[PDB]
Amino acid sequence: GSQEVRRGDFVRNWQLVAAVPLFQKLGPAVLVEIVRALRARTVPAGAVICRIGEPGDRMFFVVEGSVSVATPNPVELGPGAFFGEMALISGEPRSATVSAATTVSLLSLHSADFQMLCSSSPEIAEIFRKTALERRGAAASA
Structure with missing residues (x-):
């Protein structure tokens, strides 16, 4: 039926998640659950992580390797690079x-995981909304 899988990058995932700013105002139990709700997946060369204009409802963090962004310029991200916040925004x-x-x-x-913990904790929803409202208030560019 169902089964479990060990974790070695648990620490790297803890820092990756704990590295997130939108999750900086989060708790340890929430971060632990989030990290425990994270799904580690190996992306081979050529494998696409996300398509263009994806259904903002999922996050992804890079641990090892170099990812690229399809834009008007060659955007490459190294290890420890995270992305998907906007979707969680x-x-x-x-x-x-x-x-x-x-x-x-x-x-x-x-994103359902974040929404679950956000819905579970009103403080996270308040802090999340505050940061979301502040972030939405004015984007960051230039």
């Missing part, structure tokens, strides 16, 4: 195609 469309330039490894995180 307002389920916005990626607005670009993310693919692994080589044997990269990242972990996915269904």
